[PDB]
Nucleic acid binder design. Structure first.
Ligand SMILES: [Cl-]
Ligand SMILES: [Cl-]
Ligand SMILES: [Cl-]
Ligand SMILES: [Cl-]
Ligand SMILES: [Mn+2]
Ligand SMILES: [Mn+2]
Ligand SMILES: [Mn+2]
Ligand SMILES: [Mn+2]
Ligand SMILES: [Mn+2]
Ligand SMILES: [Mn+2]
Ligand SMILES: [Mn+2]
Ligand SMILES: [Mn+2]
Ligand SMILES: [Mn+2]
Ligand SMILES: [Mn+2]
Ligand SMILES: [Mn+2]
Lengths: 97, 108, 96, 84, 97, 78, 92, 103
DNA sequence: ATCAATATCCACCTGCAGATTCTACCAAAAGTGTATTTGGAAACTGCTCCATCAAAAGGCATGTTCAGCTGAATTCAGCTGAACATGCCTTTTGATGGAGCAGTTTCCAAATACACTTTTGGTAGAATCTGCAGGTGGATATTGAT
DNA sequence: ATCAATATCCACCTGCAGATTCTACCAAAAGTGTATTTGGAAACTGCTCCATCAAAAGGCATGTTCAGCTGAATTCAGCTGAACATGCCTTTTGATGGAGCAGTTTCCAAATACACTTTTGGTAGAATCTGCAGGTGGATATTGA
């Protein structure tokens, strides 16, 4: 009237949503171009198998999702609920990266 | 030559005792290969896939599906303390993650 | 122009019927399984290789695969695998 | 064909946010989207470099999913589902 | 009567201990501990003078390296005092838990 | 025995680790981590000892256990 | 007995610091080092040949293995030192 | 010998016998024992060149394990190649987080 | 920073002890010159796969407005962990003895690698078969203004 | 402690994309007979490893006395969700042209396999330095004032 959900409610809706699914959260075409950009910047006239670009997105999204989990722990240990660059660098550092 | 039983049958296994015996010699793991290694190694391979499929298949049950899929394989892996330890560094394509939120994050 | 490439699918599916008779397995899921099997087969033989080597021993026996498995697999998982292998081996020597 | 540049900005704010969700993240500071693309760039950079190193060595022009699988394995970041 | 502010001695110890390489655990107490832990896996085992030291060596590098990270977390939590939470956070992001 | 690893020894370690102030619960928290570490490594080492049919654990068993536990040690053979 | 690269490290030592000396404990660090590197490189060349179906490890492998393991700049010098080593060899 | 021919101070021959015997492939090229030998020598000189510096820096002529530790840890590139390696009696590089400093 | 009194810490020798560097000689490689053997680099070529392209729909990325409630700045005080002077029992030394036990080695029977021949279990595709994905529709179950 | 606006639920549908069931051919297990080879069973055997004896001198365990830090309260400025409107860029479809794998055959250049004969790297045993561990003496870094 106009009805509106409160800050955090929808976020939690999405967390619960994406944890029950397993589809790639990053858009395809946009990701293929990034793969081609970087590769091409190491060697040229390179072709990519359909599934090669896919074996990368799977690994990439599985890395970040897993990194955001660690990052979350650091924020929560910082008595916060909002993740920040600060936490990613601490996770990666502890991770030995 | 009379009847020729397969080494797997002689072992009582479903996995290929011959194929494994072969994958070994051409893998360059050592110069020679005793006849009981491919057998013993095929026996462990089968037991493990049997353990994983059992939980996976249970995963599929707990969700009205009758065909195992990646997501089911993952739920089994991340829920069995053991497999999880055995494959903590393995990432399963199309598997997703275990539903789980930190408490501090839920509302009052 | 053959091209044929092996796979463990035939054996995974057999074992599947044994545990869950009423259940089928999607292709992508069988894909994960093969990877899983080659993975472990690699971990175990690799360890086996290393073990037989550390001992100036030129052969990988049922005794290597057995240590490889104890070093590789944790607790129960290991205790059962070790049984299944022994059982399978003695059954094979008994020429059974 | 056409010059590829700035494709990292292709990994949009929406997409990343989504990944944090799966990762169980509730709130995201404004600065995290760019620190993410950074991390993401390095990750791909390292995996591709090795994938490609495997291609150049096999005398190919086509990077295979096997090249990528072998590259991730080296990174101690093993993948299942494309092994074949 | 002369006294030092709490912390002053600490820093002195930190600096001293980052210059030396000697093992920071008493040998015997440790060799006694090793024989025990190992006693529950096999019986009456002998130990090379070098096996016991290999462990002590590897071991002390694990804790030192683990206190390093633990400290980053304590500091990340805007504290200066490490606590089990920090050791717990570190070992987890590391994948040891 | 694990109580053999003294408080000051743990303090000394953390010092090398750059730790200024130590909470009182760290000490018992450290010993468990210490034990789990040694249980994991010894179990692997003795599995090589036992495999090589010997009654003595050698630096080489420790070195190989550590190598495969991801704790490569330089200085005792390999 | 128990052979070790020990004697060679000393030689190489002398070329860079003919005035310096090394400790028995430091010498052990240098062998564990050579063995490690030796394993990781041998290892990848082993794998490389297997992915491609080859049955012989050749300088080609050893070099791609080096590329894959040694950090950026260190890898180059090594690729060089290594390509040189073979040239001088094949020649005479 | 093959090493003097390759011009190396490292046992090309011995390296060859180790490759063939450590199960790596059925065959082994003639240059591989040479190449790998050259590669093992380069990295060796590099570390020694740095550890030697580190000893001199400390007013010493004999390189101990501590010198190999300071030599490696203080090099971004050897560090990256040995990050998962621990040098016995190496100790750690001196480093104290700012916040921990007085005043 | 001042003025002073602790302790701490940095330096320039000093002098043995203990690792080290340098000798003196022997098996186990490492080299050689033959004698095949064969792995995999060319020389096309069949033919999957990939890079392009056009096209119409609409599923999402983009910006902007609004303001809830989160992160960061402050003030505070109970009380936890540091700095110490104290007192002692247990870890560090260290020759010595005694002997378990890694190695060494020596055979030899069981266990393997070879080789040349068959003999089927698999795999690449036709063919038939059926979970369930994507659509609806209630009916529940969850939020949040009041 | 309601009620209204959504979001979630989960039972029913229905043939399509994606299984799983035959079907056909070999690539590769399984078959026998040889020609080494492995690596255990007894014997020993020097050599590291426990166990002793037994003290000395530390460190480690204790009990005080605060200096400081950590964690609890309070605020509030404004960063960062939730919602909404607009419309762009990805999706999904359906071929197409070769770019470049994967395959099939030829042929050395190069590797393995013996046999025979230099050399070298590894032992023990001398044969000596590099620094540790300790003294003084002298500025320093600290904490009270
Ligand atoms: Cl930040
Ligand atoms: Cl066997
Ligand atoms: Cl805590
Ligand atoms: Cl070669
Ligand atoms: Mn069942
Ligand atoms: Mn051939
Ligand atoms: Mn406001
Ligand atoms: Mn707050
Ligand atoms: Mn005896
Ligand atoms: Mn058949
Ligand atoms: Mn549905
Ligand atoms: Mn007070
Ligand atoms: Mn062409
Ligand atoms: Mn000599
Ligand atoms: Mn001194």
């Amino acid at each position: 009237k106009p009805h509106r959900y409160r800050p955090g409610t929808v976020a939690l809706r999405e967390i619960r949503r994406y944890q029950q699914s397993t589809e790639l959260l990053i858009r395809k075409l946009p990701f293929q171009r990034l793969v081609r950009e970087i590769a091409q910047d190491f060697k040229t006239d390179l072709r990519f198998q359909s599934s090669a670009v896919m074996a990368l997105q799977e690994a990439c999204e599985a890395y970040l999702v897993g990194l955001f989990e660690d990052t979350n722990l650091c924020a929560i240990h910082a008595k916060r609920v909002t993740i920040m660059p600060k936490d990613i660098q601490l996770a990666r550092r502890i991770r030995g990266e | 030559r009379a009847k020729a039983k397969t080494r797997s049958s002689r072992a009582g296994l479903q996995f290929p005792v011959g194929r494994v015996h072969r994958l070994l010699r051409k893998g360059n793991y050592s110069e020679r290969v005793g006849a009981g290694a491919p057998v013993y190694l095929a026996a462990v391979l089968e037991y493990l896939t049997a353990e994983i499929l059992e939980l996976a298949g249970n995963a599929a049950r707990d969700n009205k599906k009758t065909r195992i899929i990646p997501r089911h394989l993952q739920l089994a892996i991340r829920n069995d303390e053991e497999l999880n330890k055995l494959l903590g560094r393995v990432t399963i394509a199309q598997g997703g993650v275990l539903p789980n939120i930190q408490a501090v994050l839920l509302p009052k | 122009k053959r091209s044929r490439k092996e796979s463990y699918s035939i054996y995974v599916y057999k074992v599947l019927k044994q545990v869950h008779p009423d259940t089928g397995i999607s292709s992508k899921a069988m894909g994960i399984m093969n990877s899983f099997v080659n993975d472990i087969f690699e971990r175990i033989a690799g360890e086996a290789s290393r073990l037989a080597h550390y001992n100036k021993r030129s052969t990988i026996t049922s005794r290597e695969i057995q240590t490889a498995v104890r070093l590789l697999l944790p607790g129960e998982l290991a205790k059962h695998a070790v049984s299944e292998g022994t059982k399978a081996v003695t059954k094979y020597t008994s020429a059974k | 064909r056409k010059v590829l540049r700035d494709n990292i900005q292709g990994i949009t704010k929406p997409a990343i946010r989504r990944l944090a969700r799966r990762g169980g993240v509730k709130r995201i500071s404004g600065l995290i989207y760019e620190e993410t693309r950074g991390v993401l760039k390095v990750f791909l950079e390292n995996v591709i470099r090795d994938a490609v190193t495997y291609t150049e060595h096999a005398k190919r022009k086509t990077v295979t999913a096997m090249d990528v699988v072998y590259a991730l394995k080296r990174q101690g970041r093993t993948l299942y589902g494309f092994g074949g």
